[PDB]
Design a protein around this ligand. Structure first.
Ligand SMILES: *Cc1cc2c(cc1C)nc1c(=O)[nH]c(=O)nc-1n2C[C@H](O)[C@H](O)[C@H](O)COP(=O)(O)OP(=O)(O)OC[C@H]1O[C@@H](n2cnc3c(N)ncnc32)[C@H](O)[C@@H]1O
Ligand SMILES: COc1ccc(C(N)=O)c(NC(=O)Nc2cc(Cl)cc(Cl)c2)c1
Length: 499
């Protein structure tokens, strides 16, 4: 398949073509799309990636090049059939994380694009520092999350991970190695952030740091009314100057059947907690339960001072009386919480299964309309495995010059919701029902005039991508022609046909 001359290059020592190597890069976390590459490239350095891209870009028969982080995508975005998958992890041979915490300057961490957020955390904590914004799952690459946005419970306060980047090193689709920031090569910098790997491979990101907390008081608050739940989440993300507040705000939607016919316990909830929650979800007939998840960071504070701070905050809220659930953990245990959930799921054989996931950004003005059509109509009697996340964010912390898309509103409302259907098919036979629900959600939004934006989007036609990027589409197409003229990079995104 690949050109013969590729195997004569100095980088050919890092090209793996054995079935065992290529199979490891043929599927992703979704477990639905299978497309083996011709080879897997294991670069020792970012210059090796530039040499591979340059070879393809100057060849008679250009071939696709797709960087692969952890493969935590579910629609074949990291696959390169007919091409080469770049195993980014190879760049991590030796030391790839440098923390600059010298007195008389703003501290930062330089991390390879292949580096996992869990490894960045480990390195910065040794200096009493940490990045400000985290995804829920730390075994994701820096380059992988920055190519999307990187959202989590702190984004309402500091913006997505793409809003917490000083500069990048990018290997463009021509094989050029560019350093970019707000002040130098800003067109590439803004394009690459939420850019879905279309303009180049991120090989380095300089991440913003803040003093690290030591411990976290972590709560889940149960609500039976979506209007009360949303009013409280919006209150919690809207008093950011007040000393009484959470550092992290998320939420979860638990469908009635998912509680009643669910597990005996979870890593967060005991059997007794779950028995009480099932009672709450059926007191006046069957209801879903909406949980607010809040976390309060602290350092040297005594147990009794934290109790008082949490009480002052909880005392302002309207969750069901007697339904606060509290944990007190280290900062690392809090940020790495999903690793424990993964351990439990893998032991049950419920992790390495299909994940036909769907992530939406919904305008605040339509969130109760969304709830009515999706959770109260379409999914009221559904019992999907997995989780459903629901939480609001602030548009004022997102930079709309970056590629990443947020909902557009006529009244420029600052609040929008992230709604994530993270459902899993315990059996691959459950996939069609989940995909039918995904399409039904999108169809409901279309019929209702609810102008959502998919997050981690996937479209198989340029029409879908033109609607997704809206006002930014013309600039995106122009930057694409400049930075990846042959449309070699991450072709599994399906945004640009090969010219
Ligand atoms: C599986 C998963 C995903 C996830 C999450 C929890 C789990 C269990 N929690 C998230 C969260 O709380 N918030 C959030 O913003 N995203 C969350 N995700 C999604 C995840 O961030 C993304 O799927 C992202 O792509 C990270 O994935 P990863 O490192 O595994 O990358 P990939 O799957 O292999 O590739 C995805 C696309 O990006 C391109 N790519 C990969 N690395 C690079 C670099 N360095 N430069 C440029 N492009 C890159 C791939 O080619 C592909 O198109
Ligand atoms: C697949 O197993 C689990 C189990 C628990 C969670 C959690 N508590 O957030 C978890 N969380 C996520 O996957 N979060 C996440 C996943 C994506 Cl794709 C997007 C966004 Cl905004 C959030 C996943």
């Amino acid at each position: 398949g690949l050109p013969g001359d590729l195997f004569g290059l100095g980088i050919a020592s890092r090209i793996r073509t054995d079935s065992n190597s290529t199979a490891k890069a043929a599927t992703d976390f979704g477990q639905m799309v299978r497309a083996a590459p011709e080879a897997v490239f294991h670069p020792a350095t970012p210059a090796d990636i530039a040499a591979l891209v340059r070879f393809s870009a100057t060849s008679a028969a250009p071939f696709p090049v797709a960087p692969r982080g952890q493969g935590h995508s579910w629609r074949g975005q990291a696959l390169a059939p007919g091409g080469v998958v770049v195993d980014m992890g190879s760049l991590g041979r030796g030391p790839r994380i440098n923390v600059s915490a010298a007195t008389g300057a703003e501290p930062f961490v330089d991390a390879g694009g292949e580096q996992l957020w869990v490894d960045v955390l480990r390195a910065t904590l040794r200096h009493g520092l940490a990045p400000r914004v985290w995804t829920d799952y730390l075994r994701l690459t820096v380059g992988g999350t920055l190519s999307n946005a990187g959202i989590g419970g702190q984004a309402f306060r500091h913006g997505p991970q793409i809003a917490n980047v000083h500069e990048l090193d990018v290997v463009t689709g021509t094989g050029e190695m560019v350093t970019c920031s707000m002040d130098v090569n800003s067109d590439l910098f803004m394009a690459a952030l939420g850019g879905l790997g279309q303009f180049g491979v991120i090989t380095r990101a300089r991440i913003r740091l803040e003093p690290a907390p030591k411990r976290v008081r972590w709560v889940r608050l149960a609500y039976t009314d979506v209007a009360t739940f949303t009013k409280d989440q919006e209150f919690l993300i809207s008093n950011r100057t007040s000393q009484v507040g959470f550092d992290y705000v998320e939420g979860q939607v638990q469908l009635n059947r998912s509680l009643v016919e669910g597990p005996k316990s979870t890593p967060f909830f005991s059997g007794a907690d779950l028995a009480r929650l099932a009672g709450l979800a059926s007191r006046t007939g069957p209801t879903a339960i909406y949980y607010i998840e809040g976390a309060m960071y602290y350092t040297e504070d005594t147990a009794i001072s934290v109790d008082k701070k949490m009480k002052a905050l909880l005392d302002q809220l309207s969750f069901e009386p007697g339904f606060p659930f509290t944990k007190d953990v280290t900062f690392v245990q809090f940020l790495d919480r999903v690793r424990e959930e993964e351990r439990v799921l893998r032991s049950a054989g419920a992790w390495e299964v299909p994940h036909p996931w769907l992530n939406l950004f919904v305008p605040r003005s339509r969130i109760l309309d969304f709830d009515d059509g999706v959770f109260k109509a379409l999914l009221k009697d559904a019992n999907p495995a997995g989780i459903i996340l629901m939480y609001p964010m602030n548009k004022d912390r997102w930079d709309d010059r970056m590629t990443a898309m947020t909902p557009a509103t006529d009244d420029d409302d600052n609040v929008f919701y992230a709604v994530s259907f993270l459902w899993s098919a315990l059996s691959a036979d459950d996939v069609p029902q989940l995909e039918r629900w995904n399409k039904a959600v999108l169809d409901f939004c279309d019929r209702s005039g609810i102008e959502c934006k998919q997050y981690l989007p996937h479209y198989t036609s340029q029409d879908g991508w033109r609607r997704h990027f809206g006002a930014k589409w013309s600039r995106i197409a122009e930057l694409k022609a400049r930075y990846d003229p042959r449309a070699l990079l991450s072709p599994g995104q399906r945004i640009f046909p090969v010219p």
